[PDB]
Symmetry: D2
Subunit: 372 residues, 4 copies
């Protein structure tokens, strides 16, 4: 007997007339007081582990008292999830245009001086309520532009309209071959210690088309502006992108670990009644500017020597490149290392690369979040 109310939302339509739909599960909060939450997975279609996280999270929630509304949208991009090419989900971008599904969210470009002038007389709570209504409506308005909008923009807008309703937004992703990491805005670095995530990227106030930024930027802007008029309060919305290890993988046991960390955060925020403690583990971070993409310096076949999630001392091998077309030479086999210490986070999912193919992303200038 689940507590969840199940519905569905139409996000697009296929040529055969079949609706593209996303299933929505809602755990109603018992206190109108409590912060609400919107959790989605699998916008990048290969990144399926978020669905297992939602499954474990909802299973746990059957036994916790939910104070604030929790809305979960697994399988949030059916077009991408269902897109196969060989034995692999071509789920990252529109197969027609190449546009990354996670770069399709809407930037409101709010005239903040003006909007604030028209609503400054409201209390902090009323001001936040008006501002949220505006973010929802202007988002919904994109759906009825007379020359239309792209398939990817329609998907993104429908998801964003729901995300805007929530106080807390969690966008669940995976990397390729990847360890667990988190994208966390600067203003909310405090929150990083509640998730069960060893590595956090601290991101600035900047819109680059992603769900987390679409969700927090307008609120960050409003707050910095209000502070410049001597009206201090903390950013009313929190948004995070979780990167739950590797794509093309479902692991229920690992998903339960991730779900418990999420519950630790929801507990701390008063979304649930129970105290759920964060896991004990070493947690580190770096600023986004220090997170670097290493591109193949030449083409070849690749052995990935450096383990994801483990420190790599400068000079230790990151990859070996095999060039069997050059046997007889020193060029046939080459160890490649980096000139600084790093923590490699993820690497490319195939063992054959071109010159310029992304091999790894690595964090540099890493530090403990919670030094102890």
């Amino acid at each position: 007997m689940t507590k969840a109310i199940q519905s569905s939302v139409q996000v697009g339509e296929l040529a055969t007339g079949q609706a593209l739909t996303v299933p929505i599960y809602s755990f109603m909060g018992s206190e109108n007081s409590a912060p609400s939450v919107y959790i989605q997975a699998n916008v990048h279609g290969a990144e399926v582990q978020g669905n297992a996280v939602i499954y474990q999270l909802m299973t746990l929630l059957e036994g916790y008292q939910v104070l604030g509304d929790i809305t979960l949208a697994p399988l949030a991009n059916p077009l991408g999830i269902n897109q196969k090419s060989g034995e692999f989900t071509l789920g990252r971008f529109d197969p027609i245009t190449g546009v990354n599904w996670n770069r399709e969210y809407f930037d409101h470009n709010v005239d903040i001086q003006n909007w604030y002038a028209e609503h400054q007389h409201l209390t902090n709570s009323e001001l936040f309520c008006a501002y949220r209504s505006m973010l929802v409506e202007t988002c919904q308005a994109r759906l009825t532009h007379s020359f239309g909008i792209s398939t990817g923009h329609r998907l993104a807008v429908n998801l964003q309209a729901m995300a805007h309703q929530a106080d807390i937004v969690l966008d669940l992703h995976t990397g390729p071959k990847s360890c667990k990491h988190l994208y966390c805005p600067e203003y909310d670095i405090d929150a990083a210690r509640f998730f069960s995530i060893p590595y956090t990227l601290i991101i600035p106030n900047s819109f680059g088309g992603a769900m987390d930024e679409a969700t927090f930027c307008p609120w960050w802007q409003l707050t910095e502006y209000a502070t410049s008029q001597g009206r201090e309060f903390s950013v009313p919305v929190s948004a995070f992108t979780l990167e739950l290890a590797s794509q093309e993988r479902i692991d229920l046991a690992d998903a339960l670990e991730d779900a418990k960390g999420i519950l630790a955060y929801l507990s701390h925020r008063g979304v649930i009644a129970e105290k759920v403690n964060p896991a004990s583990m070493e947690r580190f971070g770096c600023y986004l500017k220090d997170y670097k993409k290493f591109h193949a310096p030449k083409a070849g076949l690749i052995e990935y020597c450096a383990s994801v999630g483990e420190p790599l001392t400068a000079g230790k091998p990151l990859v070996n490149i095999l060039r069997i077309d050059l046997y007889g030479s020193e060029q046939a086999y080459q160890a490649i290392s980096l000139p600084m210490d790093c923590v490699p986070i993820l690497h490319f999912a195939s063992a054959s690369v071109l010159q310029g193919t992304e091999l790894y992303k690595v964090m540099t200038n890493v530090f403990p979040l919670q030094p102890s």
Copy 2:
């Protein structure tokens, strides 16, 4: 006995060790006085007609006296050109990342006040020479960043390094199912009447990652800045993107028409000794902001009623949508029209679409370039 000197440039490398190379043909100019030209085709791999244009152009050039250097780079993106998916060239974007090959060019972000202060003492010709050396070197420098650059950025940079050497840059493209059209910066609208192209889009001074913008923007910036210090001269470089009808098509007769229009422009610019007159035809334009993408308002099977390159009076059908899944209803067949007059330029190459698929691009607020 061709006058062309043939060479080749390496633009990347495949996993098997095979070089990605672009063939380069150079017709040496006999006057160090004359403007030089760089012409490339087929960066978008499906857009093969530019190769036929280069072939007809070079055939013609065997009989004209070349005053200024002409460099031609057909087959400029071998990775994209050779990328098949079904009976179709998946040539528009990196198949790994989805990044559009024509959005990969380098924006120099020149500190223009500073650069100009260091070089103002030079004559106009010397200043232009110094500025060109800087554009070439900083472009070449991108090739040796220590974490590397993407496959697409390496391609784009190698092409751009050559384009920067020229006074006149022509990037030859095609649309999908498309009529002939041209992208022309505002400052050079005069040039549009020399090409054999009925429709021209007038573009502003704005960098969006394309070859034409990468080529002209720095020069446009320098000129507007110099004019603000009371030093007036016209923009020293010209760049144009030609859209030579439809992709996945080679038509030598049509390519000869296009080549003759190109020669008309090179003649007018003194690149060749002969007077070659522009073709007689009606020519029109619109500002870029008036060129609009019409997205499918619903999914279905599409009949493209409006001919590309012909005026479409408001209310006349653009497409019919067939929905054979809804037979028995009025929804089974639907004429779709637009609320304003337009000239449809191109449409989508497939007859099955989703909600949001791009159906057409159409020009609005069209006017004669050369009213007579």
Copy 3:
């Protein structure tokens, strides 16, 4: 007020849980006497014109008296129809395995001597009824094998189970860039003159995995066997594959022409009450063994000189190959012709090919079907 009863059939299931369904329209026959018909389109997902044919056919049928059941299955392969790669439907084969959807039908391998021995005592009509029940059941049985069957086999089997119920089966396809042609078994060449199709391929009694063969072979086998026991009757089932010009195209006017030819055949067979005459046009055929694939003798860019559907005298150019990488040589441009007269039927949809890419299929040893 359509006469059609609309239903739907589930042919598979997507990872997100969405059913793959095919819409079914049935015009009930008023005479239990009359032959029944099964018509499907778009098993190859790019081959969308068959849907327009079904639309025109059903529109016409609203005004004809239907004597025998007519079942229509447009949009018969939703997975394939909805599979995009660039601006093109990758609809021909399973994107995971490469298996051609039209090579997935089930060969019953009937022990014909035995089956006939057990049922020889039945009248011709009863024997045909028993045989049809067996073909339907053994087909349906494939759906519940304990290790399962492939995605493509499940699709094919569900379609075939319906096709087996009918006396007349029409599988509607298109070629790539193609003229109208028909695949007709040898025993039913008489039927070819009723369709509005200039070129017919006469196929033997041979199973190669296609819907037409899956449908007619068992009946052809039964008949030849019965004839060897001195029991003469004509093959009780008719099956045809129609190739309705080019893929990625919807043309309602052209579809109406095709629908009228289909009605001419259904009329002649007594499926409808009215006399509908075949169109007046020259009709030709060749045996399948004389229909030939011409492969690119070298790679390059291709201009398709020979028009589909028109005779090509030996020595007249089929294609020109442009090799802009070889400018300066005779190899840069090469006319390719064939050593015998032919009728080119279809050619490759892209203008860039490899060595060995299929360029054309051409009929040789062509003759009038209906010499006059």
Copy 4:
């Protein structure tokens, strides 16, 4: 100072004019007495581990005395190896037609009664020499058919022409997510104990388009026929397909293990002078008919519970299927097991499947090869 002589063979040509080439390394044998060997890898382009095996094998061979010629063809399908789709090598089939590269080899259809009658007077050694010349020439003849042959047939034929020259043919492949296994014809089961491969599939005398069958079938046919004329000798050629664990992976240490097992076999056959012993390990086999494909009984997200290469007792879980679209039901999570004991060999590389997607291949009726 490598002993290998390096050359290259052209196997096709790309639209830009670039040759498709395969690098060939030859270790000359010092005894005209000794059996020769042809070893190729990576015909399926994702299956890159064979290149690492060739690298380790050649490194070892620098220190062994080579008695018989050894020819190695790594990177044997550059078109397939270089074909990317997302972060994955779409290397299994022609991206244009869907035809599996490993189903493209040539079946000679030798009229064996006739050929043998014309050559019976020859000694066994002379007969084998004549027969090999015929297999090479008729293969080469396929390259000059006047309507050409497919891209895939041209590749396959060029490889096969070399394979036919050798006494021993090793085609090196990988599975998807897979343990090490071997395809071994029935007549040569003895050879299986020399490789370092725990599981062997015993295949019959049957041509299905693969390199191993193209190589051994004609010789198997000749031998069975000669035996029917009272002329007994053992099949003069040996061919094996090695499946070296998982695709999209290079592991040099694991490749060295595989190379040592190959050397064990070459030693036993007198291709090298040294005695190299086989590895000590348990080895098992099953007949091909007992090796089974398990297809997804419904669509969903998949957790692969059964480890490849380990026995799975009937009733133990093979996969769990997660259906997050059905949360609240028993259908949300389902353990799937098999009704008989098996050894799962490989599974599907993605975690999202359709109804009918291949989940695993499993061996049944397994037995020790070398019971002890």
